[PDB]
Symmetry: none
Subunit: 31 residues, 3 copies
């Protein structure tokens, strides 16, 4: 279970990462 | 709309994970 | 191990609140 939650926080930090990228692109696009 | 829904999801998955982590904490100290 | 998982969770939750607030900011900017 410890490994399960460690793998889950990494997955979600990765997702956050890509979303922050999308936020930056949206900001550019909406000018 | 696609970003709204993914952040909605992230927020629910992160809150769920926080609860599980807190439970695991009780076991491990 | 435990404290590293807890820290990463806090990292994540702050990230997700910031994303939540950026989404709101963008919705407004799109009109």
């Amino acid at each position: 279970r410890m490994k399960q939650l460690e793998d889950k926080v990494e997955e979600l930090l990765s997702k956050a990462y890509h979303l922050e990228n999308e936020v930056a692109r949206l900001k550019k696009l909406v000018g």
